Design a protein around this ligand. Sequence first.
Ligand code: Q49
Length: 165
Amino acid sequence: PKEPEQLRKLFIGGLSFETTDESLRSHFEQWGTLTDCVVMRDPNTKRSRGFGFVTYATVEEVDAAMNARPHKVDGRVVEPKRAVHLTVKKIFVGGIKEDTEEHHLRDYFEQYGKIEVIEIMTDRGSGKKRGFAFVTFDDHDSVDKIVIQKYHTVNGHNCEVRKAL
Ligand SMILES: CN1CC[C@H](Oc2cccc(F)c2)C1=O
């Protein structure tokens, strides 16, 4: 049972105009089997549009490629992103109620990426927990992995997680 193809793709921006299907493939095959690899070109001039995409056989291979950033492809640092692009480093986490603490959020979310800020929201008047939080990571891929999951279970609660700002 293969993961949906959409979840196995990486959109690569910032390509050198000299990158080809073949050179993009040779680079990204270092992190997995590529079932597809395309440089986007103008239909008349054939000149590169400066971006393309690759499709891996599995999501773990996407992860491996993302974990190997920064990628210098044909002499230029490129910008790979997965499909979810609203590129942000912060998430809203809702439904955590009053008993969820910082360490619950950190122990779970730290496995998606490096956390810089955890903000458990409290009432401006009473100080009581409001039941939601924001987590800021050092990089957008953490957020992208998070928001494509169907479910997040933290401190026994099924949470609603969305990109923030
Ligand atoms: C999630 N996004 C935003 C841009 C990207 O657009 C494309 C579309 C086709 C080929 C390609 F190489 C890139 C995409 O599908």
